[PDB]
Design an enzyme around this catalytic site. Sequence first.
Site, PDB file in Angstrom:
ATOM      1  N   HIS B  80       0.858  -1.114  -0.167  1.00  0.00           N
ATOM      2  CA  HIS B  80      -0.219  -0.051  -0.076  1.00  0.00           C
ATOM      3  C   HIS B  80       1.033   1.173  -0.138  1.00  0.00           C
ATOM      4  O   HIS B  80       1.912   1.228   0.650  1.00  0.00           O
ATOM      5  CB  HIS B  80      -0.857  -0.061   1.028  1.00  0.00           C
ATOM      6  CG  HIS B  80      -1.965  -0.857   1.002  1.00  0.00           C
ATOM      7  ND1 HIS B  80      -2.898  -1.187   0.189  1.00  0.00           N
ATOM      8  CD2 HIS B  80      -2.344  -1.798   1.969  1.00  0.00           C
ATOM      9  CE1 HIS B  80      -3.875  -1.918  -0.103  1.00  0.00           C
ATOM     10  NE2 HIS B  80      -3.630  -2.472   1.406  1.00  0.00           N
ATOM     11  N   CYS B 129      -0.187   1.974  -5.186  1.00  0.00           N
ATOM     12  CA  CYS B 129      -1.107   3.114  -5.402  1.00  0.00           C
ATOM     13  C   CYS B 129      -0.731   4.471  -5.234  1.00  0.00           C
ATOM     14  O   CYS B 129       0.050   4.624  -4.366  1.00  0.00           O
ATOM     15  CB  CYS B 129      -2.421   2.908  -4.746  1.00  0.00           C
ATOM     16  SG  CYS B 129      -3.478   1.428  -5.235  1.00  0.00           S
TER      17      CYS B 129
END
EC number: 3.4.22.-
Lengths: 234, 234, 4, 4
Positions: B80, B129
Site C-alpha cells: 500500500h 497506489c
Amino acid sequence: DQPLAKDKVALLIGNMNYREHPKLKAPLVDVYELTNLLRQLDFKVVSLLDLTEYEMRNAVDEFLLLLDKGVYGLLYYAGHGYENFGNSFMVPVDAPNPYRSENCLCVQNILKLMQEKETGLNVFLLDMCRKRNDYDDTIPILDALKVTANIVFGYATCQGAEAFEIQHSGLANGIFMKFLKDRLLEDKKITVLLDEVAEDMGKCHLTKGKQALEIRSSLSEKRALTDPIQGTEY
Amino acid sequence: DQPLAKDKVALLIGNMNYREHPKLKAPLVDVYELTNLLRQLDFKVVSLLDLTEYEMRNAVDEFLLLLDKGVYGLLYYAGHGYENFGNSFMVPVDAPNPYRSENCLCVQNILKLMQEKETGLNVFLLDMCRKRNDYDDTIPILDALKVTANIVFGYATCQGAEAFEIQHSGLANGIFMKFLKDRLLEDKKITVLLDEVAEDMGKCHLTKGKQALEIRSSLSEKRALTDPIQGTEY
Amino acid sequence: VRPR
Amino acid sequence: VRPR
C-alpha cells in the site's frame, strides 16, 4: 501497425518582456526554431510571443478547439515558470511582483482539458524554472487525471531547479532547445527521443549540477512526432 | 566508455499482512522474482516482507550504509502507498486507520539521503497506489534536491491512480512485475528498458484505463542495471 | 484486480 | 547563464 495521428497540432509560447520580472532573450529564437521543425513534421503550429495572462488563456482555448479524438497535441512554453506541490505554472508577462497561482496558467489544468478531447498524444515541453513560489498560498487539490497512457512531459529542468539560456543571449538558443533542435526530426518514439536529448545535455559543461532534462511519461504506444496523419499519403 | 558501477545494491520490500488495511498477496512473489533477477545482474539484494514502520526505517538505514560514491542504488516497494502533493509514501503493515505521513516513509526523503552518498545511479520502482490520503493534513515543503542527473522512477501506476495485482492472486505476479520480469535482464539504459515495459503493459486488457506505468527520469548518462562492477572482469 |  |  504504424501508429497514426488524426491531426498534429501545437501551441508555442515564448515570454520575454516581463513588466515586473527579469526579462529574457532566448524564447524568441527557441520558439522560432521549434516552429520551423514542427512545421517540417506537418504540425499545424500557432506560435506567439510576450503574452499577458489574458492572451495566454485565449491562446490555450484556441489550441483546445483544434484538438479532437486521436489528435496529437503539443504545448511548448519558454519563459518564467514555477512549481508548487508538483503543479507547474507558466508566468505571463503582466504578472505582478509578487504573484500567485491566480495570475498564472496551470499546466495540469490544460492537460485535463486536452484529455477531455480524447487526444491520441499529449506532449508538454516546459522550458522554464521549477522552483517554489513562496508567495503562492494556495493548494491544488485538483481531480485525479484519467489514465490515458499517452502523456509525455519534457521538462527543461528538474523540480526545484532552474532552466537556463545564455547570458546576453543574442542568437543562441536556450539550453533545452540547443539540444532538442538536433534530435526532434528523428523518427523515434518521443520518449526515446527526449532521453537522447537528456544525454546530449549532460555533456554541456555550463549546466552540470544545475540543469538536467526531466522526462515524465506514461505513453505506452510507440508514438512519434513524425507519425503520419491518417488519410494522407506516406 | 562502458559506464561502470562502483557496486550494485538493492533493497526490496513487499508488504502484505496489513493489520488495519486490506491484505495483499502478490508482493511475496513479486519480491521473490525481482530478487532472483537482480542477483543474476550481480546486485547485492536485501529482500524483506511485511515490515512495520520501525522495520522499514531500519531496512532503509541499512541500505543507505551500503551506498557510496558511484554505487548503483535501487529500491523496490510492493504494498500500500499513497501520494500527496507529488510526494509518494510507503505504508507499513502496522499503519493505523486512518494514518498520516508520520506513520509512513516518504520516498523523496530516501532519495535525498541517497544523493548525499553520491551514488552513481538512483532507481525507485514503486509498485503501489498513488491516490491522495485525505487524512494526511500535512505539507511537504521539502528542500529542493540536487541536480545529479541520475534518478529514475518506475511507478507501477500514474499519480491519482491505482496499481493492481490479480484478485486471489495465488502464484501470479502483480501487473507491474508481470511485465517488468520479462525485460529486466536486457542490456539497455534503465530508462529505455522501462519504456518497453510501459508498452507491454499497455497491451494488458485487465488494466486499460486504470493502470499505466509512469517513468520519471533525469538520468543523462547511459546507465543500465547490467553495467559491470568496476574492477571485476567483464 | 485488487488495488495496492 | 541566465535563469528562466
